[model samples]
Target: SEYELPEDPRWELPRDRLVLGKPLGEGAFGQVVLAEAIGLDKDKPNRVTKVAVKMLKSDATEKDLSDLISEMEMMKMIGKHKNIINLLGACTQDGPLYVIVEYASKGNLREYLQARRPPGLEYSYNPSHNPEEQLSSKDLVSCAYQVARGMEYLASKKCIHRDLAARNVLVTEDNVMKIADFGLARDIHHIDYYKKTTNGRLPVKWMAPEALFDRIYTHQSDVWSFGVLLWEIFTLGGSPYPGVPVEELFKLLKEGHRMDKPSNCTNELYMMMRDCWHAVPSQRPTFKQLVEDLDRIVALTSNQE
Candidate 1:
């Protein structure tokens, strides 16, 4: 049933304003394409702006379209934050729905790190690589701190980002990190958690033990994922829990097994990572606390040089 899109003029972006370009990436829902926006204002019909357009596939189901609408609404509600991705506008009338967001010139954080690493050394962090090409410890700390700040804002908004990982973060040309990919974001209920009722694909490696066993989601579980994301950053994009099979990840986590500190990560940072991985969800530090802790680490590291 393809009904009329909601008549929300505030979010309705005109299809004629966009000139679609090459494909940027593809996901389960649809593909993102690079585009240029012209005529943002009726007064300035020639104004040009580069943007990332996330459009739903033509074959998408009604449910998928509904979810896409939900996603756009969530982004609008989240609003503009420095570390959170900004949604410029959206299109629903003229074709597949289009979600226009600020373009990240450097792409996602994971790929940014991967590009810095030497060929064939994909899984290992090599500090010996050209100093100009490698990310300094300071850079890693800054990225983690920026992500923590973004998550902190989301926490304050009572929003739980179910997927908080390195790949979900986008990096700017100047290395600024912004949290993106809100396909799994949901509002926290009065109970402060969301319970999963359906059997769907989950990011096993980044999931918390309780989430794996009981299908519960909370800001605390997001903290667990953030710890793994930090590991990915310090390891320069290495896979978390390397060599551990996905089938055994749940059992291993339940048994108190955790990833070792990345060779390049500071002890203080590793301690914070461990805190986020605490078995008890209540024991995990709030994103506010994480932001403060990361700031202190950044200050200390900056002073050391």
Candidate 2:
């Protein structure tokens, strides 16, 4: 039997809807198109709404849809959290699956950093622009603290966010940060204990040792990724391994080679980062502890220095 897909799902595509400009951005899996609501009657015109339409590519396989749906479900689960991205609705009609979300005008952190280059450097990874400017001595305490708050909230519910990179973080116009893309989240309650996997490695450069080698990812691993995320934020969105190649990054991490966070970063915050990246994952501080430590540092920054 031959089956043909529908032309357009009636309920999914409301009539007289005005498709706004072009896509705000695009990724490997899908692209987000901007849109608006248009009324049928001339008396009632159209109202502009900032919406991000996430659509699966036509060539995407069934397995890919499954993965995308799984991620969408995770997003829905954690969507209520203020620090997480909101998932408005989804369209599985016709051939493509679309995920509608709130449009963040500022885009992602990388875009924001690119617009405002590191204090004195021409490029983010510039080797020579006043070492001080390369990595600001005046640490971003507020930003780091906000990130910790998000992590603490997630950890409270035992949700393990496997991907915590800067790109996945969206900064609002008012400087509020939100974590997005929960494609790799795993629930802790389901598994009795941490189980390591040898395959499906995450971003090796930013991954913790246990995650890279043993695949034993836990809440602590999320903290480790947080440390890297902090570094990225402090260093003006520089690549995790500036000079080192991808293959050698894991070796470097194995040999206890971690990026030296700027000297300006407060000792308390630096200590937290170090604790997060400890070789022994068990030694890492809990998210609650991190929240407390970050709060102390924030208070110190506010009062003293």
Candidate 3:
């Protein structure tokens, strides 16, 4: 039997145990700061692990706090997974709600991809450090497999990653990718933000037709985003459907249009990506299927190397 994902009573971390450091960033209702959790490992009393702390804004509305409470609760239930951002703990019962999660030293995946663009193609591939950091086709596919596996776990936990994108993925110093918001920016332009007036900034380009049309977000809907994400990976973080306005995107997608093979994208992998974009959401490949398919593809790439 699969181990039942459990709750963490330890989630109620003591405030003093944390040593807040530099500011990470801020969201609408919270500020993310770098922190050191003293002995978060229980037995490792002398060790201090770096963590990203999501502190509630003092100005947040009641609804925001309530929502954050459930977000932490749900995240706890989801538990630890290799590819998902692991929630270490939270200072929920203390002054101003704060969440502690493992910090990815390399920042988010999109920025990493953008910085490590294919060599010689754009001459922009330098984060000025490792030449080995230049990305290859296999590396992109590997990230795709990791995200699909993580999302599959989320699906099993009955959790919805409403916002799944390359931008929401984080990379460790070891180049391991972890999904996080455990769900932005550079969100404008690249075509449109149709719901900016109403929904604030829905990813019109990435939403599955069912999500866009009926507000439904099923696992298959995630598969849709997975396809768009694959496009981003293959493009080395290029925005999906470049130059096409959001209104035009709607019309074209209504007519069953999908993105084309990105530059350097192989026919085999593009076929897999297209499978995720199946017009019928039910027909979309499950995360398990994507992982299995990518395993075969990854094997092929490894063989040639």
Candidate 4:
């Protein structure tokens, strides 16, 4: 049932007066602009604070506005967590909705992988391809450990991030991971109905089998998404299930074709991912178990602080 948008003027900025700059990025709703504060923190305050300003497109439908509102509401509930993306503020005028967010300086994970790519057309990290190039086992474990930590933290709050892909995972200049984009997020407790759509807005390749089938998604489905994310991290941001069409990707998932980590991934990491990608969602390891497994692997690989 569609309802009229609230007129309470919930989205308004403080009196600090934001300094808006050129566009940082663009998305379905609108463009994210870079912003700076005039007198924030004073006394040699940080040079500039990067914030993303999301303005709703003029032609956006009520459903789109609802999705934006839901994202804002959910973000407010769990935004304070370290691993989750931070929401600064929002604005709503006429019909255009705007959301202010923390600006990730390093961009998303995919960009990072492209920067670290090896020379030539070859994408493999094999020793024969580049004898001088060797990624330490410890580094691999560290990456996986960071991802698991982020997941464990989200799960602790009983929040299931439906969209957990390379593009949604942002890395700061300091190498901190922040999960962004909550448009697909839903509150499991409040969902009283289910809608089945063969084709909807989703990253087909990164979706779990249950999600692809239009069934009710749970925390375990998020675990499956995390497994795919692990493979992406291992392969240095390779496309998930590349060359497969959306329908075929769903078919393969139903046929028990799960994600395979890169050759360089350690056996322990591979096993952990395998546990996460179990065919039965119930059989999948819980986030607590995943954190424990990753901690063990990190301890064996490096003296992580």
TM for every model, in the order presented, reads: 0.86, 0.75, 0.87, 0.77
Greater TM-score among 3 and 4 belongs to: 3
Among all candidates shown, the one with the greatest lDDT: 1
Q: Who is ahead in lDDT, 1 or 4?
A: 1
Q: Which tens-of-lDDT digit does each residue in 41-160 have in candidate 4?
A: 345444556677776666667666787777777776764655557777665544356677777787776656545555444354333332333335565566666767777777777777
Summing lDDT over every window of 10 consecutive residues in candidate 1, give the lowest-scoring window: 191-200
Colliding pairs, model 2:
none
Which regions of candidate 2 are displaced past 4 Å? Answer: 1-20, 37-47, 93-95, 121-139, 184-202, 302-305
Which digits, one per residue and each the tens of the lDDT, describe model 2 over residues 1-305?
A: 11232233322444335354687665545566876545423455564556677766656566556666676676656646666666655555534566666566766765555555544433444443333222233235666777777878778766787768787788776667777665453544443123322322236666778877777778888989988887776665667766666667768887898787753455666677788889988888887887787777665665333
| Tens-digit lDDT string for candidate 1 (1-305) | 45777767876778878999999887655778999998655577778988899877667777677777787888877778888788887887866678898888888787788766644433464443342365666777888999999898888887788777778899876678989875453434332123322222235777888777787889999999999999989777777776666667767887898899876667888998899999999999988999988898887776332
Best-fitting candidate, measured by TM-score? 3
Name the regions of candidate 1 deviating beyond 4 angstroms.
39-45, 118-132, 183-202, 303-305
Return the candidate ranking by TM-score, descending: 3, 1, 4, 2
Residue-wise C-alpha lDDT for candidate 3, range 1-305, written one tens digit per residue: 12222335777677888999999877767778999999897778778889999876778786666666666777777888988888888875536777798899988777788877656663334453553346766787788888888888888887777568887889987788898965322122243356452223347777898877777778788888889888888777777886887778878988988888876778988898888888898888888888888888876775232
Q: How many clashing residue pairs appear in each of the predictions shown? A: 0, 0, 1, 0
